[PDB]
Design a protein around this ligand. Structure first.
Ligand SMILES: [Cu+2]
Ligand SMILES: [Cu+2]
Ligand SMILES: [Cu+2]
Ligand SMILES: [Cu+2]
Ligand SMILES: [Cu+2]
Ligand SMILES: [Cu+2]
Lengths: 311, 312, 311
């Protein structure tokens, strides 16, 4: 039958390596759900529900035609059951029924990855919106049979909207707020679970001259992202994460429960800012990340300020 | 004047008219009636709907690019206001709205040429436009390419809409339209085909394992943009924004307000597949949830049941 | 080096002429920021922050491979500094750092236009959302080296959402409302800065038989547009302002901080209404424009009302 291979899965913002196999395999993935309290912002704590200890879950990377076998464990300290719906999976609930797992239990199931693409996976236990809004989502990349083109740098980015009882900035442990969630009025909108998770000392890094690809998911639960990198243009966009390629795009829509792949070349050093360009989200609710690029200046691409005079 | 005349075959949702087996233009005659009527929105919740032909959405029309569409548009004498129709398929003043303004008890006729293929919203455009749309007056007209569309085993007609009631969702009785919530874009219900449960439970769509499925998806709005997804399926093909461009291997696709999309997939194994707007509180808290029930033989090679349950 | 050329820029809804040049140039652009009070609607005044005296800024048109040299002046009557982030620019802030300009000063800098497309530019001084929400955005078109196809008529259209302390209709000078902006609850949604800016006596004009191209931007700050022209179908859409072309589209998404190009032939006379088809925006918040087309009727394309009888 098919050979068995253990999956390499990565914590955001890292991405598993490209697959060098030209035949189908049974790829074994282990996942654990963990409820834990973490910092959403300075002085603000939140009780996240997570795949494997953070938001988003770890990235999976398989090849079209693979069978994906999932061993799904719910930590005994969890208060509720959890499960997983893979948008990459064809069949009931994307796997949700087969993976329904009470605290302190393990479920196993498998599915065939019939189509390439970049797929959200998320918990689907009722009330589904709360399980997602507490942070239970990630991406699985299903490569085309021939692979994707080579790039220098790859990053794993997932946007989410969060609903707290207090206003943004209100200190302490902030509970989930169902009324704000139903009204689609989030207090925080973030990349990778937390304000500053990929900014500042957590900034992404590259060098001038390098090609960059970002695997961008939107776990929602509710918002649609107008995704943009300040100071860059997307040379290529895989539209809605599908096969169709657009070029020379400044800002691209990432549907709720959907994805996009964007590619660009960083030509000169600087700090490049990832945003949701519904711009009060970025500068007032947290939807802001950084890519720091080192290397040599090149005035032919962009200069510093050349003069300052009276007007 | 010398074209043959064909009576249109139109369908109530979720059904779709047969494919056109024509490689030549015709004059297609369409009859429409507008009716105001109280129906159930949800358990114990009633709503005064304004409708094309007695339900939400209106009946689906299907013609071929290059056809002349002759519309006979009647407003039921019981209606309280005039109604008309703007076809996004039509080129010219108001998409036909200027030519179809019809008082209760009257009938208007006009015609237009369907110059471009696509999947087009049609809706009432009487002032105030947002209320006429928000009360349910929208449908789809499919204009086929001259060579037709590929064959598929099953076709469905789905239209999302957002609704604005004075009471909160669940509040019992006849709920009036709430202008202030509509202007704020804060709907109480978000539904497929006009009502909670319209294509779920006993009303679920039906297919058999092995069949290819095409869904004609509209968004009448008035206000929301849909992130459309089928739980347990991947879109093999998407006609982007309802146009000529085809995307493939898409999990969730944007349906603009007043816009559309065509999606296609193959249902490989049995199960209950859920249509949602994946702005997910709309799906599970406001009604934007449909079901496709597929019967046939299991296939563990596509997906298994739970294989084991052990202590962790 | 490069020949130096002065830019021809235009106030909306006009577009600069097509570029016939077959060689790269250094294109000099002068921009001034001005804060001024203008009418938003009948009896409603608003303190706008503008590029060159209105909303949107003047449209810039250059050729892929040009160097764009910007002379950026901030009027001494301004209360705060202003700058510009060009989405067409590759590098720090899209130029925002290099163009940071206090009231009464002029900055200069330059950047190379590396990719064709239709790009938003906007102010990026903190708080970014407020500078954008007060009116500081425009479009720059970067033509492909071979130019775009010829059309008869071209228009410059930019949607924006505005946040006033009072409800829509409230008279007098209306201050910016930060709370409504953070909540994404605008009072006005308009084309080109004001209610009626391209309607009525300000309507766009064409003649039956002409091909029309609209360069459509969305300055936001927050809303995504479902752009539609009542009575027309888009023959061509440059998706998200990029290279990919869709055809036969009734309504297209314009991302926040993004753009689209749409093209259609006007076949018969009439009044064709530009709307955001999130339709309460168009008929209750101001997102309504008009294209008046003169010429001969053609009943084979659409008839008038042919009869009115009893039912
Ligand atoms: Cu869960
Ligand atoms: Cu999902
Ligand atoms: Cu009506
Ligand atoms: Cu419409
Ligand atoms: Cu400014
Ligand atoms: Cu920007």
């Amino acid at each position: 039958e098919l050979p068995v291979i253990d999956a390499v899965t990565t914590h955001a913002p890292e991405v598993p390596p490209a697959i060098d196999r030209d035949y189908p395999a049974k790829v074994r993935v282990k996942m654990e759900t963990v409820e834990k309290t973490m910092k959403m912002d300075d002085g603000v704590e939140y009780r996240y529900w997570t795949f494997d200890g953070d938001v988003p879950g770890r990235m999976i990377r398989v090849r079209e035609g693979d069978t994906v076998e999932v061993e799904f464990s719910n930590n005994p300290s969890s208060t509720v059951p959890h499960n997983v719906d893979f948008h990459a999976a064809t069949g009931q609930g994307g796997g949700a029924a087969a993976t329904f797992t009470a605290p302190g239990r393990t479920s196993t199931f498998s599915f065939k990855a019939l189509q390439p693409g970049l797929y959200i996976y998320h918990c689907a236990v009722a009330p589904v919106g709360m399980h997602i809004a507490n942070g239970m989502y990630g991406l699985i990349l299903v490569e085309p049979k021939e692979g994707l083109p080579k790039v220098d740098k790859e990053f794993y980015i997932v946007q989410g909207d969060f609903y707290t009882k207090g206003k943004k900035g209100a200190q302490g442990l902030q509970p989930f707020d169902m009324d704000k969630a139903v009204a689609e009025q989030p207090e925080y909108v973030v990349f990778n679970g937390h304000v500053g998770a990929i900014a500042g000392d957590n900034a992404l890094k590259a060098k001038a001259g390098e090609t960059v690809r970002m695997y961008v998911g939107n776990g929602g639960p509710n918002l649609v992202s107008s995704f943009h990198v300040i100071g860059e243009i997307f040379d290529k966009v895989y539209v809605e994460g599908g096969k169709l390629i657009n070029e020379n795009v400044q800002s691209t829509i990432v549907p709720a429960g959907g994805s996009a792949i964007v590619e660009f070349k960083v030509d000169i050093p600087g700090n490049y800012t990832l945003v949701d360009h519904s711009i009060f989200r970025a500068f007032n609710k947290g939807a802001l990340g950084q890519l720091k690029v080192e290397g040599a200046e090149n005035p032919e691409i962009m200069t510093q300020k050349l003069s300052d005079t009276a007007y």
